[PDB]
Symmetry: C4
Subunit: 32 residues, 4 copies
C-alpha cells in the first residue's frame, strides 16, 4: 500500500536525479 | 498518506517543467 | 483521492508522450 | 485502486528504462 507507493515515488526522486545528471552528460558532450 | 502522495505527484509536475525546460537547454545548445 | 491520483498518473502518461516526442525533437536536430 | 496505482508506477519503471535508453540513443548520436 500507501507508504510503501510513497517510498516508489521517492524511486521515481531517484530517476528524476538521474533526468538531471545524465541531461547535464549531454550538455557537458555539447560543453566547457 | 493520500493527500500528502498527491502533493509528491504535483513535485514529479515540477520535475516533468524542469524535463521541458532543461530539453529546451539542449535544443537552444543545438539553436537560434 | 485514489481515482482522481490515478487520473494524475495517467498526466504523468502525457508527460512520459511529450519525454518521447520532444527526445525524438532532439534526435531529428542531430537527423535525416 | 492501491495495487493496480502501484502496478501504474511500476509503467512509469518502464518509462524511466526508456529515459535511460533513448538519452543513451542521444549520447551514442553525439559517440564511439
Amino acid at each position: 500500500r500507501m507508504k510503501x507507493i510513497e517510498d516508489k515515488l521517492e524511486e521515481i526522486x531517484s530517476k528524476x536525479y538521474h533526468x538531471e545528471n545524465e541531461l547535464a552528460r549531454i550538455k557537458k558532450l555539447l560543453x566547457e
